[PDB]
Amino acid sequence: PPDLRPLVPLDGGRFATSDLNDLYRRVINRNNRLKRLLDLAAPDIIVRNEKRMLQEAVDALLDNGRRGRAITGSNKRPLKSLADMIKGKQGRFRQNLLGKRVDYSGRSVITVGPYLRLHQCGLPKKMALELFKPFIYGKLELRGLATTIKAAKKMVEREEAVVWDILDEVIREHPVLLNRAPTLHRLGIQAFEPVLIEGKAIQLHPLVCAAYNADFDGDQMAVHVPLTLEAQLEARALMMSTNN
Amino acid sequence: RERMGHIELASPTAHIWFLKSLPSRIGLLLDMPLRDIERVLYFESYVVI
Amino acid sequence: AAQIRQLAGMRGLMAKPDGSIIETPITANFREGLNVLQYFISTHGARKGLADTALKTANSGYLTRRLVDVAQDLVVTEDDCGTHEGIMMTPVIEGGDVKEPLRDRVLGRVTAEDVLKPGTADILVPRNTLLHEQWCDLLEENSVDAVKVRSVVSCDTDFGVCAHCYGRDLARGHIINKGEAIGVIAAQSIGEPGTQLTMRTFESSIQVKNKGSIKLSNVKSVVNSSGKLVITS
Amino acid sequence: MVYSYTEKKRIRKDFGKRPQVLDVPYLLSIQLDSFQKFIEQDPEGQYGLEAAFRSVFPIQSYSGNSELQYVSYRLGEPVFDVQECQIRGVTYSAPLRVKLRLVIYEREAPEGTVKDIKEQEVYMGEIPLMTDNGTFVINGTERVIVSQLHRSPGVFFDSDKGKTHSSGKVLYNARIIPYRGSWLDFEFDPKDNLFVRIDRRRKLPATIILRALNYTTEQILDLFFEKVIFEIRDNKLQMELVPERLRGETASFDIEANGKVYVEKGRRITARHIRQLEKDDVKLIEVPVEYIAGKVVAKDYIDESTGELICAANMELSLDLLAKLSQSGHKRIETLFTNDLDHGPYISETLRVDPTNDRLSALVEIYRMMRPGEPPTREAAESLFENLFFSEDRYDLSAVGRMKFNRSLLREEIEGSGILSKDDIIDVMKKLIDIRNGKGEVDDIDHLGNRRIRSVGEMAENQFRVGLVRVERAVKERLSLGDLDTLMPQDMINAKPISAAVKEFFGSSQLSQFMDQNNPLSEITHKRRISALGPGGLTRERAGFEVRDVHPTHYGRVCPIETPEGPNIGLINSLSVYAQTNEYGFLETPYRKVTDGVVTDEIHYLSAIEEGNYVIAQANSNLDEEGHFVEDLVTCRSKGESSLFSRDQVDYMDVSTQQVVSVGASLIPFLEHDDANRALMGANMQRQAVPTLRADKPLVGTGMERAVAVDSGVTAVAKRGGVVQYVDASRIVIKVNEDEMYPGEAGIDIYNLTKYTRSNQNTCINQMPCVSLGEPVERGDVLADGPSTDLGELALGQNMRVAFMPWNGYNFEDSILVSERVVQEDRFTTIHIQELACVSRDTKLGPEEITADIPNVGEAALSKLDESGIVYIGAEVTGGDILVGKVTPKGETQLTPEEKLLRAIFGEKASDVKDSSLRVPNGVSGTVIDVQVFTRDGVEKDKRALEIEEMQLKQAKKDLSEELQILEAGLFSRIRAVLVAGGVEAEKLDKLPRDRWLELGLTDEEKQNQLEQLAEQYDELKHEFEKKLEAKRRKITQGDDLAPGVLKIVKVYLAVKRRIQPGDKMAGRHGNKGVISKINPIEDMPYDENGTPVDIVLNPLGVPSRMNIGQILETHLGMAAKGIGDKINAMLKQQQEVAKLREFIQRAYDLGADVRQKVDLSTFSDEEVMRLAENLRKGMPIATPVFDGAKEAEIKELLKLGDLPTSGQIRLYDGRTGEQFERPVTVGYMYMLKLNHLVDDKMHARSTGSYSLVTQQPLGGKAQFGGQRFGEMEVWALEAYGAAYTLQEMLTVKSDDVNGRTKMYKNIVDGNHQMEPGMPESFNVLLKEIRSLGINIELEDE
Amino acid sequence: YLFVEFDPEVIHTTTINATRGVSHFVRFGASPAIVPSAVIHQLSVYKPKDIVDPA
RNA sequence: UGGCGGUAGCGU
DNA sequence: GGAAGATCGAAAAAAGCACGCTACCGCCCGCGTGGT
DNA sequence: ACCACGCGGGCGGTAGCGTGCTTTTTTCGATCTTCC
Ligand SMILES: [Zn+2]
């Protein structure tokens, strides 16, 4: 389908063409030439050569570089054929199926919070506001402060005091998942109770650093927000720092 | 995102997944060497039927 | 001890990249000043370690990925296999030093069959009991070394393993629950310490260092002219 | 010594015991000189464009009548300078104009004499020029070409460790590597034969190439193997015998000469037997008949009676063959001497295996292997073999390649031909055979003598040669096709291929890297970098352990400390301080020659190969007077090892202790007390420092800061000495001295300091004036300090009060606690400049234009914009504001009466023009500081561009007016003196204007003649200045070249003042790094007895673990320096007399233990002492050399000089409680750096944003506002926990379920936490992909 | 498509492959294909046809 | 506001 | 007692080479045409 | 002279381009070795 091979505009009057479209165009042109020459009563040698070219074009489309010389585009690199972007590290299996980008996520450096409890983690107020935006909108609609989603959008943008109170109330005991980039074992991702802090750095419990293999040398940590009752109970019971 | 097209090839072409992925499926089925299949597919030698 | 020794004492011998030991060691303290030659000599080990870590992280990650794949579909799906066959577990001793004792090796595991008291033909533990700390202490009090314990490799359950044949959860006092993804946990546990490892490529008689009796296994021998025994096995 | 003017302001105390003999050379000399060799005219054709032109030109077509020759080349004057190219975005380059002569011979004349000649100059593209700072300006961007470490051309011998066949037998190989041509390889096999491989293709027997070289079988046998002659004597066929040939073989027969049995049959030969045989001088001996049969026959023998070959070459003989030869009448035969211990029959075995028989068969086989599928013919095979190695056009061995080839073969001729010869191949094969036998040793690939450095010049020359040969073949075809009479050189050649190749090399090459601009040290390190990566080099993954290691030959050439950590470990290195490149390309180091036990001051540059032969003493060797060594035994490096040697065996000594380390590593004080890993990471990290608001000099330094600051182009350096006539924050005008006057010029020079210009890393570049009005200056002095530079000294950080102690866990594990006073004083506040670009192009419907009027926007949004449509300069802007208003036509247009009539009617033509105004990105705030407008020719210019042009013209007019004012003042003084020489007219002249002075005339004499001559000179000078101003105005108003389609570009610069905050990355110079944890109040930090609180608190727990003791020593030294500065400030506060200040400063400077530096304050004129004390009021800088720094005794003495404890630890009180601390803590002053890793820059948080259009997944990256990626190990960790609902929510609801996303959003808005699984879109994409691959895949419902 | 008559021993195949304008030899397998003389003879004379292919 | 390639860097 | 199954090492083809993140650059057919 | 597209495909050449891994799997000259 064309949507699986989109023609993204380049914002300069040109269209970026994917490798699949170019390979399909090559195959179509070769097939049309073969049909035209067959209708022309061409000699046996020419027909055989055209059939061989059609076979090679189909070969390049199905799996480029499998046999002979890999077909190269304007970049002087082999084209990403149909099977090229299925297998490998960049294939659909290992890039869009096993692991995928998710919403309601943030990332920042980690500092040491000595006052934090074992089940608590310091979260910046900006992250709490941005990540819990749908929850803030729902609470604002329930309280009657705003009548529509747009009014809640303006209220959140303007940073009203009622917005801050709503943010404090709605994330009072909503667990969040903290994860480090080299997640070796299951302890690399753990649930924590957010505590509103100022600044721009996530505060981490000193005790959990050993299990996290976490370094206050500038390491970066990511935070995700469970957003259903099942996930909230699951993080509270199975993945909280007090349960490990 | 769902509708798919089709192209009517002038002449049949084999699938390389069953031809070059060792062991060759056509060669195993027909009990012929892989190079014979490669030669006949790439228009090198006539094959009796 | 090594780091403080390097700080206040001599740095000791250093090794060239080929692995050979340099005749002249570094006799300068970190508190004192190291000349250019000593620093140039010492840089070799640091460079080797950094390169080893850099080129070993990827290998460890690949091994962890393969291990987590090979056991991704293994979960607990039963409570008891009923099999009376298990692995024969004894403490491991290498040379003149005991590597791992029985108590730590069989902690949090279930016996495949009832272990009897040595020499009395009296049962010491039940057939299907889980060996916790008290059971291990009782077993070691009676000087027991050989125990038949149920193992995952002998789990008779198909399309998964049974809770009993696995053992303790190793993270909670109770036994393993039903439905836990033991395969992923095991693979991650094996693959995590891969970084701690290293990728670096580098007697005519027996001695006794303790007091005790001597026992022989798989032996046929003969007495020599002087009377000393010589083994023919 | 006489201190320089900039040095007299603030002299840094030096603690170096060793006296320096050689000054630090220019750091960038590796680059600039190289580029000179690429552009300087060369009388002989071996370097630069001249060599390429001589290699390519001349040309002869298929018809000999036509010819084209090259005369000379000239580099044109660049249109714009560095600054104009940088601002305008054009590439800094110069035209390349070459003189070409087209000669048409007389076709009718058989001898082909000249008939017509046409000489003309032709332009063949723009060659990019490289700035005086060692950088390139490509497409308006600053790029740097790094050197490449590559295997040198020549013959290299290698031997694998026997793992190939897995029995311990090693397979030797010899590789011939030309600069340009076909790599050749000779390899051994387990069967002990020789195989030749060309370009890593199929192996062939090595004798094939010898046969193809017109060598017969017998010639090869004689050349590769010695022969033993067996002659038919009266009986037993006595042979000439050499005793040494009998070593190591069992006596198969009794040996006897002159009737004396030396040994009998069946007994092993002994060395005593060999010596006895040599003493006997035996030349003839008896031979059993069976002994000859074991040997093989070398020369084929034929008999005239039989007419057939009884024997041939190279096969095993036998008894029947021996009898046939004996009866044939032949009496003399020659056999091979085969001894398995030392002379293996590898050549004979290879020849037996070889199926070729003559030259034609070998050539046919070589052609078939070279080009499979082509018909083997005699002429084609001959041509291919001749061109493979014996053609200068195809095979080219460089001069360094020839030198290495001759050195490895032990030939005494360094110079030689650039092509291979038969003798060279024969010698290579013989050397390989000798290596296999045991004689000699294999070469080391990691040896620095086998690795060459290719600079920018060599790669540029290679790319130029490629373009030149392309244009050469193109011009060959054009000349052959075209009509000779009417062909002109300009249209004859095409500059497209050469220009394209040059542009691609300069812009898109792997080694053409974006130059960093964090600090001058980073730029210096980047310029002086050697990378094995690149074309014809090692790959990141396929590197191996061995190459990344530090070879012993790296001493003095490549520092072992400064190298990137991670994937690029051991592959990227930095040049040493004294390292330099030889003419061949090998690195060399300076050394001091030691003769007769004394160390002379003369220096010699020894390369890597020559270093091994001699023995060199270490730099840290004590020397008494006359240069004798105090110790009987000195440590030395003789052959890749360190050992003790006697005093009189030394031949060379290291120049300085900084030779081993690089410039970046040498900047770290107390390096000898730092661990190798910590020092490595500190040296790497120093390049990431960001300049602060105010540059603060390092209290503890290494003395190399001045060299780094001066060598870098960040600071302004006075080209000529003089006095500062005019000093200003914008420009500095200096009147040069009478001694240094260039003839025929005004005598003033103007420096325009760059101000608040964005760097490559979005960092502000600020140049601040240093000198004052009337202050004399001299050549080489610093006039204005660049970024992170103080008084001509590089300063990447600030001196802060540091106390080592845990503080309530806020310093847990390398965390840093920062007092509020740091934020209050803006010590580490930084400025960041960001670029925002708006493009107005020509669309199909209609061209877009910038206008103030924008649809459906409030007046508040348009308030920031001007009438033209661009935000005012200096206006504070935030996220969502409109910096520039742009509207694009849509739907319909070209209806102006309706537009005028309906400008505000309810239709408002909203669909006709849609808003496309550039807006500030969300989360970005700052102040607009610069606006640039670029407009293509033929398009009406807006008023803002007119104002920018008027400002530029005003600046140029001001400079030209200053110059003209100086010149006219001089000329009018001259004319006044001339008039006074005649009619004085003093009273009226004082009352008369100078142009009325020109108006006045004198009587007819020589005075009137010179008066009118001076008037003519005056008007000529005025006209010349008018022409110069007109040219400058024309250059300013010249239109800018834009991309096809865009007609205007607007660039806006936003300045952001970033202050320190928790989460920012801070660190020192010893590799200790951390993140700010809490901005503690000033009243909470611990304070001393005097009540002064500390600024930074560091955790001591990190000191013993990393073994970086140097930071503690630096802290103690900084404490001592700050105590000295405190004493100076105290004596300055009492208004004490200059005598006491002089005495105290002299006492402070004279402290030490036989330091090389001596300071005499008696020659400071009693006035510069006050300035020095004012500069030293903050503190006294101390220069601590790298490996020759101050000891503990000197530090303790310096501390005792001030009123400070000798132990370096004081008593502190807790700020909050006020109670005494149980133990004294270590306080002092430490140099802290702010890294380029800001916490606010790492901020990223997304709840619901844009999604990819192919996989329906959230985007990635902070700029694109995308969520974080849940990796595979994250899924595995969730599975280990037993997480199922959370995993499903992560995989479907949050990422791919398009319906699920909307349902969940509407549920959360409604307050219900209900989840719908749906089905991921990526699974459907995969299903469609597999279906399109001809493979059925469907979901089975039942 | 272009038919070429020449002797390989006079002009080598590599030279023809390097001729300007010619892309590559029509080769089946390693060796270039040889056109039989009958095909050339039949294509030289009566191969052209007045039938219009583009409709 | 889409990706590909190259380069450099951060964290292990 | 010269051929057919075994094999044996030697050569050749194929697949994989940790994860997150940040910034910059360049590039997003390509040249040979046809009407004006 | 620029502006726009339209059929093709490695490139420019009257040839040749590559050139520092390891492990697994497949095939084949060539023996070999056992014997039909
Ligand atoms: Zn079981």
Author numbering:
A (entry chain J): 246 to 489
B (entry chain J): 99 to 147
C (entry chain J): 734 to 935, 947 to 977
D (entry chain I): 1 to 1342
E (entry chain P): 54 to 108
Provide the authors' own sentences about this structure as they appear in the paper.
RfaH, a paralog of the universally conserved NusG, binds to RNA polymerases (RNAP) and ribosomes to activate expression of virulence genes. In free, autoinhibited RfaH, an α-helical KOW domain sequesters the RNAP-binding site. Upon recruitment to RNAP paused at an ops site, KOW is released and refolds into a β-barrel, which binds the ribosome. RfaH recruitment requires a 12-nucleotide (nt) operon polarity suppressor (ops) sequence, which induces RNAP pausing.
